[PDB]
Amino acid sequence: QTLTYDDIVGTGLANKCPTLDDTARGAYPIDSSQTYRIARLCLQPTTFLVKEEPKNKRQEAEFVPTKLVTRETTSLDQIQGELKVNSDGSLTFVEEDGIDFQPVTVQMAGGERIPLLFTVKNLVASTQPNVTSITTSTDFKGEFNVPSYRTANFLDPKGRGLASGYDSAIALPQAKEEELARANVKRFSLTKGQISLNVAKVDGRTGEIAGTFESEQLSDDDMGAHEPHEVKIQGVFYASIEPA
């Protein structure tokens, strides 16, 4: 029943996390003497929400739902790392390597596109203490780093960039520079994002866990040219616990 690439290709299932059947309400014993690792952490986002900025300071600044425009390019998959068992009984996922970032663009009402680097780069995420078995009440809370959406070689349409490019607006050779400084000086942001993985299904036999996530992070700031928005990402996850 296991699928091949020619079955999957062009169906959109390659952007999906694997699922566990409804029957898998079991529990996975964490032997404290044995080490563990994560063979594959998948995260499939379903809902991207962006917080508006009402120009008033006060008011109800809630998260509005957006429309994805960059198609089924969104999931993080093949993420590996060590699942430590701590002293106090809690499990901490340290993220090592994988496809741990996807550029995503969503669009608000009015047509404003919001680019974001949807990521869990360098995710440290820990459970609660005294969890001797991963059950359906386990919650991996943690934080990750959000690097700049473009890296340092990226050139703007006027040829300006951080590690490459012009340092000024060459089409305006005698303009005053201080009003153009926020566009002329490219700045590499590095911010933090928070994520909570809630387990809903456990394969007690194999060691496959699945559930839902909620992730909060900043969107792209266009290398410092504008303020980033606050993004809330919701979706499903899948993790397979191999003992190491």
């Binding site: 000024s168 089409a171 305006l172 050779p173 005698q174 520079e177």
Partner: protein, 56 residues
């Protein structure tokens, strides 16, 4: 290369600059020749060279 700029005569006479953004900015002005202070505000000057009546 530790590049500095010193000005002699004119408005910045005797002044020396060493911070690399400030030194680079006068170097981008020095490609045009002698460096002048302009009032760009009265005419909403766009910063883009125009020809003279000799050109027109």
């Amino acid at each position: 290369q530790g590049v500095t700029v010193s000005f002699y005569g004119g408005e910045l006479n005797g002044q020396t600059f060493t911070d690399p953004p400030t030194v680079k900015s006068y170097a981008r002005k020095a490609i045009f020749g002698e460096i002048f202070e302009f009032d760009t505000e009265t005419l909403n000057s766009d910063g883009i060279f125009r020809t003279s009546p000799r050109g027109w």
